[PDB]
A paper describes a structure:
We applied the TCI strategy to human carbonic anhydrases (CA), metalloenzymes that catalyze reversible CO2 hydration by producing acid proton and bicarbonate anion. Catalytic domains of CA isozymes are highly homologous and bear structurally very similar beta-fold. In this work, we investigated fluorinated benzenesulfonamide compounds bearing sulfonylethyl ester and sulfonylethyl carbamate moieties as possible covalent CA inhibitors. We showed that sulfonylethyl ester/carbamate behaves as a prodrug by reacting with His64 in the active site of CAs through the elimination mechanism to release ester or carbamate moieties, thus forming a reactive vinylsulfone group.
Numbering used by the authors:
A (entry chain B), B (entry chain A): 19 to 50, 50A, 51 to 54, 54A, 54B, 55 to 72, 76 to 82, 84 to 125, ...
C-alpha cells in the first residue's frame, strides 16, 4: 500500500454546501484548445479501474489569473444497474457517474515533479445524471466501449470537443484541496466540482456501467473510492 | 534585465480592502517554534540592499491544513529622513517600513526547486509604523545595526522571539500570489500581509533608515520596489 493513501487530506469528500465558504475570488474557469480537430486521433483505454482518454498537448485550463494548467487525460467513475457510482457526494447523495479531467501545473514539466506539491495537479469534476436525450459528445466515447471491453485494451477515437463532456456553466463550482483517489493518493490536488451536472441517456449510463470488464473476470463497475473526512478543511464555493 | 521582473503577476501591489475578497476559509496563521533561545546566535548581515537575519531550522508555519512552511530568513524595507519605505501600500498609503519573513514549503527540499512554483515560497509581511513607545523586539535588531554599517559586513546576534516582531492578531490578513520584489522576481510566491501594524519609536525608525550603507558610498535607504499591477488577481481577506 502507498502511505499517502492514509494522509489526513484525502479525496473524494461529501460536499455539504451549507458548510461551504463563499469566496468571490473564485472566478469562472477558462479553457483553451479543448475543441480538437478529428485528427490526430486520441487513445481510449480500459485500464482495469476506469476508462481513460489520453489528451494531446495544447489543452490549457486556468483556475484564475496566473493559475495555469495543461490537461493530461480524463476518466470516469460509475456504479451499476440501479446503483450510483460518483466519487464525490452532495449532502450524502451519490450521483450516477462522474467525469474527471486531470491537469498538470505549467510550472512542472512532468507529473512526478508535481505529485504532493501544492497546486501541482488540478482535477475538474462533474457529475453525470440521466436526461432525456442522447449526449452526442459522450456517444463518441460510449459507442466504442465494446471495442475495449477487455481489461488492458484500447482503441483510437477521433478528436472531439472535450469541453462538451463538461457542463456549460463554468461559473458555479466548489473547490477544495485533496488527493488523487487512486494510488499513490498524493495530496496537494486542487479539486473543482461543478454545480451544474451533465446529462446522459439511460441507455448511455447502462453502456458505461455494463460494458467493461476489470481484473479477474469481474465487471468493471462501482469504481469509486469511499468518501473521505474533510478533517477541518473548508470547501469553498464560487457562489453564496 | 531579469526578464522575470516584467512578468504579469509581480509584487508588491496596492491593497484596497474594499476590493478584497473575504473567504472564511482563510484561518488564523499558525507559527510554531518561533520562540528562539539566546543560543545558538544568528547571523545578521548587511547585504547591500537590506539587513537580513538568517533563521535556524524548526520555525514551522501553516497557511492552512497541510499547507506548511519553514522560515528561512527575515529582512526589512525602509525609507529615509521623513519618507516612508514599505513595499506594499494600502489605498495609496506607504508605511514607514515593512518586515518580510520568507519561508520554504515543506513540499520542496530546496529553495531552487521552489522558485517559480506556485506556493513554493511564502512570505509574511507586516507594516511598521511610528508609535510613542520603544519596541523591545525590534531594539534587539536595531541596537546591533551600527556594527554592520558597511556593505557586506555581518555579526552574530542572540536568538529572540521572531514572532514578537509580528502584529497582534494572526486572524486578520490579506493574501495574494505574486513575486519576489528583488531579482530574480520569481512568481508563485504567496504573500500574506497582516492587517494590523507594529509600532516603533521615531528614534528606532531613524536608527533603521540612517545606520546602513549601500553600494558605492550611498546610504542604504528606500530599498523598496514600485507597486505592480494586479492584472486580474483578486486580493483575499480573512475577515469581513
Ligand atoms: C488508475 C489510473 S486512472 O484511471 O487513469 C486514474 C484514476 F482511476 C483516478 F481515479 C484518478 S483521480 N480520480 O483523478 O485521482 C486519476 F488521476 C487517474 N489517472 C492519473 C494517473 C495516476 C497518477 C500517477 C501519474 C502517472 C500517469 C500520468 C497521468 C495522470 C492521471
Ligand atoms: C537581495 C537579497 S535580500 O535582501 O535578503 C532579499 C530582498 F531584498 C527582498 F526584497 C526579498 S523579497 N521582498 O522577499 O522578495 C527577499 F526574499 C530577499 N531574500 C534573499 C534570500 C531569501 C531566501 C530564499 C529566496 C531565494 C530567492 C533568491 C533571492 C535571494 C533573496
Ligand atoms: Zn478520478
Ligand atoms: Zn522583502
Amino acid at each position: 500500500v502507498s502511505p499517502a493513501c492514509a494522509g489526513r487530506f484525502q479525496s473524494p469528500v461529501d460536499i455539504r454546501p451549507q458548510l461551504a465558504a463563499f469566496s468571490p475570488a473564485l472566478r469562472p474557469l477558462e479553457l483553451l484548445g479543448f475543441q480538437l480537430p478529428p485528427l490526430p486521433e486520441l487513445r481510449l483505454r480500459n485500464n482495469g479501474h476506469s476508462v481513460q482518454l489520453t489528451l494531446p498537448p495544447g489543452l490549457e485550463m486556468a483556475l484564475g489569473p496566473g493559475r495555469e494548467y495543461r490537461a493530461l487525460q480524463l476518466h470516469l467513475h460509475w456504479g451499476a444497474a440501479g446503483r450510483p457510482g460518483s466519487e464525490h457526494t452532495v449532502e450524502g447523495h451519490r450521483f450516477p457517474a462522474e467525469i474527471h479531467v486531470v491537469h498538470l501545473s505549467t510550472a512542472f514539466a512532468r507529473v512526478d515533479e508535481a505529485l504532493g506539491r501544492p497546486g501541482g495537479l488540478a482535477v475538474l469534476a462533474a457529475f453525470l445524471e440521466e436526461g432525456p436525450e442522447e449526449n452526442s459528445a459522450y456517444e463518441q466515447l460510449l459507442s466504442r466501449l465494446e471495442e475495449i471491453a477487455e481489461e488492458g485494451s484500447e482503441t483510437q477515437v477521433p478528436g472531439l470537443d472535450i469541453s462538451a463532456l463538461l457542463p456549460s456553466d463554468f461559473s458555479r463550482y466548489f473547490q477544495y484541496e485533496g488527493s488523487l483517489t487512486t494510488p499513490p493518493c498524493a495530496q496537494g490536488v486542487i479539486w473543482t466540482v461543478f454545480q451544474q451536472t451533465v446529462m446522459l441517456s439511460a441507455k448511455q449510463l447502462h453502456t458505461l456501467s455494463d460494458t467493461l470488464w476489470g481484473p479477474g473476470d469481474s465487471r468493471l463497475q462501482l469504481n469509486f473510492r469511499a468518501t473521505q473526512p474533510l478533517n477541518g478543511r473548508v470547501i469553498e464555493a464560487s457562489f453564496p
